[PDB]
Amino acid sequence: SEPKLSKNELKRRLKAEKKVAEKEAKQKELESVDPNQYYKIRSQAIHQLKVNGEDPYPHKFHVDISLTDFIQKYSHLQPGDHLTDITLKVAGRIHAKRASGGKLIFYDLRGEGVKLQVMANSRNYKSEEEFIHINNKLRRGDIIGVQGNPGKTKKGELSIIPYEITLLSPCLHMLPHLHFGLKDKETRYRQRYLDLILNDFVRQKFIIRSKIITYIRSFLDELGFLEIETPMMNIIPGGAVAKPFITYHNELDMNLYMRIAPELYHKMLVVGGIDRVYEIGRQFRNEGIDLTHNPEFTTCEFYMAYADYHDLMEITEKMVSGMVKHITGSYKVTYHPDGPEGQAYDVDFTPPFRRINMVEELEKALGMKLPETNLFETEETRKILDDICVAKAVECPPPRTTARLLDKLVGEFLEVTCINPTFICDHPQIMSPLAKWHRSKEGLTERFELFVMKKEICNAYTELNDPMRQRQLFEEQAKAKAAGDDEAMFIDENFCTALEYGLPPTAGWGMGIDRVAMFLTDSNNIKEVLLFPAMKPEDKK
Amino acid sequence: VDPNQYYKIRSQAIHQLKVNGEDPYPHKFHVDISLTDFIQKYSHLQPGDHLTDITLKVAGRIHAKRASGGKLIFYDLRGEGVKLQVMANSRNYKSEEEFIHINNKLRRGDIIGVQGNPGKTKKGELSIIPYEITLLSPCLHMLPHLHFGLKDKETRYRQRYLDLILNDFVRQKFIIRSKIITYIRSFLDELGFLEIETPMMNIIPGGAVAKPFITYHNELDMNLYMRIAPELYHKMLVVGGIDRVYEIGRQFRNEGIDLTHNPEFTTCEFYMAYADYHDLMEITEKMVSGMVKHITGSYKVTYHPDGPEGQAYDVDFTPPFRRINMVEELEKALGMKLPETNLFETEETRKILDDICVAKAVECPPPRTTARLLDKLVGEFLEVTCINPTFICDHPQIMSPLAKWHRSKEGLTERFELFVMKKEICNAYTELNDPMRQRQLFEEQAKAKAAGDDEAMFIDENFCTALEYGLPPTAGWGMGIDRVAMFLTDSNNIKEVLLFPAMKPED
């Protein structure tokens, strides 16, 4: 092979040689697999069980009662009780095996989030020899089914005294002890099943997320909202700045672009004659990943005809307050943005949220008088904004446009104070298209953003139903995006036609499910609420 | 006249309205009552009364502008699928010059708001005599003719908003689809299941037999395959400890687009622990029959596989569904005896199947493997007589690489398929929890993929590693919720039950 190999290889070789030499010189100075290879030993034991007729994978086990119902029903037993006239069948995973004797063993069946003891005594078993056989077969982590009578140990521990234990599914890997558990983030994310097995709060987090999604659906349906399914791929890239997920279709011999937002289809449906629509689904944005961003994410978006953002500002209040009260049981939650050892914030979700106007509050905070709302589009405003950003030690990467500088100032000043849920309303028209202009104050739009714990969770604005202005903004977007080529594919010509056919005054709303889940589960990472976060594979040999 | 001329003239008129301070896009119009509630509450009125003490505000799209002189104009407002009449009279209107002004700017298709008093005409038609009509959103395009509404299938599918505006049954179809999904969710939630969400981008595609979509992740230089089935993640979750899980979601397939197949389609997959396919066979009966009874109002439905002018089939959804076996019924239909089920992974059985397909004129493009030949034979002989819902169970393991082996019959699996109207809607089996047999099956699929049969399932190390941690005896079930909508809404086309179906681009 390699001449003189590598000093390393050479080095590695000797140690081995030294290792085996010392090993033989020691053991013989005085085939069994080493105990650390639990997988091989367990696999060979299972294979031997298969060959001699004791197949460890039964097709069907009839469960009479769940563990939670068992605990609820038989928690009233006194110590030493034994209901010899009641027979029940339960099932679960073994988490402990305390052998107090040759004929008395204790198992800890953990399932459904609860624990039930199993005190196996050969005196109560059907016979001694099968008791020994089954207790020799069983290991920790094995899924087993237990048929027996309820009882309570002299200590006062509820348990099921088994008449017959059947192995349902053996475990071929070492199962970590619950006292240390699983604490490595990479291991927890790569093996979510092990995370659920060893950690109990993960199951509660996902139950909470499911409860969140159910509540929203129920509320909207009672209001009279219809659930819809819009396409997830389109043949048009669109004019959005967010980078899409490209895909190829061999039959159409073309590329298909993943959905960024279902807004256009919802508005077309409202044009069709469905006044109130909603959809909870996935959005795919080919962008960066951090604690509060994921490339694919679940959002709930609804559209309501004959409404403005003022009505949405009350509907959102009712939604959020009712959901928090229904799930957490109160209006005040505790959030740890930095972790269980960092500072804890008390977030109050009382019905009437705080409402602030961006321009006035920014003037109050920044300390000076920004230009009038009609003069933001002038380069003078851009210049004075740049001067203020430099003076206030705020950094904005280029380009230093008015929209980006204003967003940076808002994030730096108006956003460190949004601990409790707060509405920020009346954005400048430049920072936001697709929102109807403000009916009273010129130069502002008709949107609002709900911020909880300095993070945006909701986003709603009066939909622009003017075909001419919408077409102008779409063409400006396409001009900026295309940089040559043809805007033909950066302009939706069917949405414009629908708008020309006529859209009623509508209000659109959209909420991030994941972020709400993190806020209601005390999780500072979005991956804590995703069941299977995307992890690049670990190179292996 | 010319639609282009109409559009140009209406655009000019609306621009003139804008520049004159008569904004045709008001920010807010406070609607007080819905059209359905208006019809329900004031249908008791006598033919000719006029309740002048009640003033309500409604809104909707004008469907007809009939003129009966210079002082009386009838409008046909259409809202939530109902009809209302607006008899604008100069006397009741706020002002005469304003009556003329508003009547010279409104045309059919416009979204308008009407504030007025309920009443009835001498002909006994419920109406709202307006006190003030407000134009909310003009319609710049000429709507199709009243007697020549949208009938071209391509136009209806490409422009769904026009279909909703002109055709009323489309809204009912989509309402029924929503009802189907809500019923499934309620059934599974009350059973004790937990709704989950599984990744739509998978490093390795798996869970079904299909051609995947390939995308490129930006933060992750690795490419990602779109979801074809959430099966391998549901099983991992059941390994985790959640005994009953379910998910209604979108699956993607890179196959051809036709009148029955779409690139993205909605399916429901629930997974039960400590269950077998014999329990799912009862649960599916209960839930399908209950859904049919709850939506249609009865157990018997009528389906037209080739349009309303074709033959009508009466499908009965009595809770108990017929049950048949693939091998036995296939032998009975073929009038012969197939080789023993324990010799199905061999070559002579493949030769026998090929000879039978050739003799019976069954068509199967290459590769002519045993699984594909069996599928073609079953489709040609078994599913063509399953009008009423029927269970076809005990499939060979060559046709199911993720189903557990049958208890008593060798070479078969513990699975079943629900066939209604000669089409499959459901697919369920007892999950395979043995890591060694699952690895052997995965290995066999790779052999095939290597030489042709690219549709063969891919290999996954993570799923096998999870199986090595102990998967309880479980049963999985999956229903394609597009065909259920087609059968319940009486539509022989997937595009009918899809809001925006994928269409071939037009020149």
Binding site: G224, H310 | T36, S178, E190, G290
Partner: peptide, 21 residues
């Protein structure tokens, strides 16, 4: 401001009595 009331499509008061097997 309370939006007009439209009636829920998917019935109401638990219209579907799902028959759990």
């Amino acid at each position: 401001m309370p939006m007009y009331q439209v009636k829920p499509y998917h019935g109401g008061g638990a219209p579907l009595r799902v028959e759990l097997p």
